[PDB]
């Protein structure tokens, strides 16, 4: 590894950590809300 740079790899691993944190926070945010009724309730209550 003659051309290895420590600063570039530190930046890249910081970017990877930030990306993983963003993925976690977005996955938590996009499934936080629960439906008022839900598909099962609406399907049960919907007559032909």
């Amino acid at each position: 590894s003659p051309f290895y740079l420590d600063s570039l790899e530190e930046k890249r691993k910081r970017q990877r950590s930030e990306r993983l944190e963003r993925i976690f926070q977005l996955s938590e945010a996009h499934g936080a809300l629960a439906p008022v009724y839900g598909t099962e309730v609406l399907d049960f209550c919907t007559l032909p």
Partner: protein, 49 residues
Amino acid sequence: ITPGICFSTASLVLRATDVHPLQRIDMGRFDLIGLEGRVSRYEADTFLP
């Protein structure tokens, strides 16, 4: 047959309601009506927890 009415306005007017994404919050965290027909009670209550 008549030509239509060409109503001319300032270009800045069409951007009056536009807000940059860095200046507004995500309103999808309060989207309850969007979950209807797409999200089930199973997903919210049994699977995700």
